[PDB]
Amino acid sequence: TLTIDPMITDLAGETSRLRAAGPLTRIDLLGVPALAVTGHTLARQLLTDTRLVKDINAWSLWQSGTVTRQWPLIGMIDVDRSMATVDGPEHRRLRIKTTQALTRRALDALKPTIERYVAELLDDLERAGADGAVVDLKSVFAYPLPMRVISALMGVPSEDQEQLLTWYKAFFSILTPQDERLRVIDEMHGYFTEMVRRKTAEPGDDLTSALIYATETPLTEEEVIGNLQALVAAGHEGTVSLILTAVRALLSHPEQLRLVRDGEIGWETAIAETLRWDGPVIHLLMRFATEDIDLGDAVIPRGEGVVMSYRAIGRDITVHGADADDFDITRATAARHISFGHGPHICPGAALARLEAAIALPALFTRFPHLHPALPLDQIPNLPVLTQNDLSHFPIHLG
Numbered sequence: 001t002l003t004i005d006p007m008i009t010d011l012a013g014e015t016s017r018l019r020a021a022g023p024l025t026r027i028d029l030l031g032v033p034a035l036a037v038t039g040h041t042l043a044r045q046l047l048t049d050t051r052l053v054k055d056i057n058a059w060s061l062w063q064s065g066t067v068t069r070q071w072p073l074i075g076m077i078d079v080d081r082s083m084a085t086v087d088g089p090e091h092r093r094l095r096i097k098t099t100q101a102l103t104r105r106a107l108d109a110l111k112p113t114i115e116r117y118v119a120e121l122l123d124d125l126e127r128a129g130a131d132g133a134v135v136d137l138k139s140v141f142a143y144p145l146p147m148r149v150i151s152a153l154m155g156v157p158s159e160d161q162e163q164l165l166t167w168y169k170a171f172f173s174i175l176t177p178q179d180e181r182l183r184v185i186d187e188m189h190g191y192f193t194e195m196v197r198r199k200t201a202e203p204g205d206d207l208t209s210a211l212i213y214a215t216e217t218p219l220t221e222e223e224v225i226g227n228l229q230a231l232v233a234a235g236h237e238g239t240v241s242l243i244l245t246a247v248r249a250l251l252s253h254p255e256q257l258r259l260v261r262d263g264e265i266g267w268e269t270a271i272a273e274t275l276r277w278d279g280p281v282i283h284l285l286m287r288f289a290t291e292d293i294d295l296g297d298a299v300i301p302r303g304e305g306v307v308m309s310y311r312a313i314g315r316d317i318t319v320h321g322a323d324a325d326d327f328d329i330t331r332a333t334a335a336r337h338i339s340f341g342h343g344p345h346i347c348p349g350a351a352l353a354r355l356e357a358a359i360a361l362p363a364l365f366t367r368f369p370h371l372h373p374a375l376p377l378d379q380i381p382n383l384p385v386l387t388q389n390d391l392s393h394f395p396i397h398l399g
């Protein structure tokens with residue numbers, strides 16, 4: 001069994017240990033055992049296997065009361081009913097209105113909004129960078145942008161977004177005391193409950209109102225609340241990491257940065273290789289076997305929990321080759337990654353996340369062509385967030 005270090009002290013060694021022990025291996029998540037899927041081919045297979053569900057009531061550890069809400073990771077699994085917790089035909093019903101809102105056409109009408117948030121945040125970088133002062137790319141640029149974009153889509157007031165970010169920081173950190181974590185989870189549920197009620201009595205041009213007023217069976221209020229929570233949480237968290245890890249990877253590989261600025265390699269292709277090599281998700285919790293799953297050299301027992309170790313999956317040497325642990329935007333398999341998932345629960349906002357990074361990254365390097373880091377890589381740790389690739393900071397000189 002591999003114990004996942006909640007402090008993320010040795011992410012590179014742990015990721016390689018997971019790859020070496022895979023494609024299926026036992027992990028320990030803060031005292032709770034589970035199975036981690038670390039192989040790319042096995043992941044794609046299980047992600048489309050209908051004997052694996054997200055419903056926590058299918059977990060034997062939850063049924064028996066062995067895992068309770070005292071577990072610091074329980075907020076990642078015991079969530080309100082939504083597209084993230086259901087499978088089968090009900091899943092399509094809880095997802096279809098959202099996917100209609102995230103089409104290639106639908107995002108075109110949203111593209112100018114993103115471009116304005118980007119331009120506003122670039123000005124914040126310039127203001128904080130007066131007199132050659134080092135600026136935190138994260139806190140000034142990468143962290144606020146995805147929250148402003150998902151808030152505009154969902155209809156979250158601008159005045160409320162700081163509070164949401166404050167809640168999410170405590171929610172993700174393993175250093176949050178468990179009584180405070182549970183209080184924040186409750187306060188967040190109460191916030192989105194009251195927002196859904198407010199939008200029910202006053203709909204707007206936003207996705208929350210669309211989820212309430214669709215004209216199949218209408219979503220229950222619980223399901224709208226659950227979808228809203230999953231959309232804001234995933235919608236703001238992942239893209240922050242993507243923007244920062246892409247900048248970090250290209251600044252430390254200047255010859256590849258030259259390729260994208262000169263147009264030899266598209267930004268969309270650099271974003272794909274960032275997702276494969278250093279993506280926003282480390283481990284995805286959690287799936288549960290409704291019956292014994294015979295793989296042929298291993299069995300997944302009924303009721304067992306199954307984690308998708310997407311970071312290890314991205315480093316799969318069988319699919320990507322011997323240099324899988326290297327960042328190379330020119331590799332042929334960069335588009336074959338599954339860092340947005342696979343199967344029916346594949347990220348519904350994958351196109352929006354790709355668009356946000358595809359706007360922000362060239363915007364950043366056009367506005368500040370000579371930007372460079374103010375800290376070396378060994379002084380940029382991950383935050384203690386076990387399941388997410390969350391960077392502490394990225395100080396830069398604007399140049």
Ligand code: HEM
Nearest residue numbers: 083084230234235238239242280284340341345347349353
């Ligand atoms: C770089 C940015 C992002 C990454 C890497 C990412 C990745 C993922 C992954 C790995 C999953 C779950 C796959 C699984 O179940 O195994 C997921 C689910 C989900 N994501 Fe994303 N995501 C990103 C951005 C977004 C955005 C922008 C939105 C919304 C606009 C979003 C909304 C969701 C939702 C609602 C789910 C649950 C879908 C379901 O269970 O049917 N995410 N995402």
Ligand SMILES: C[C@]12CC[C@H]3[C@@H](CCC4=CC(=O)CC[C@@]43C)[C@@H]1CC[C@@H]2O
Nearest residue numbers: 075076077079084229230233234237281
């Ligand atoms: C894990 C995640 C952030 C946490 C999200 C999760 C989707 C379901 C969910 C809804 C909540 O109420 C809290 C956070 C969670 C648990 C997201 C899937 C993509 C992103 O990485």
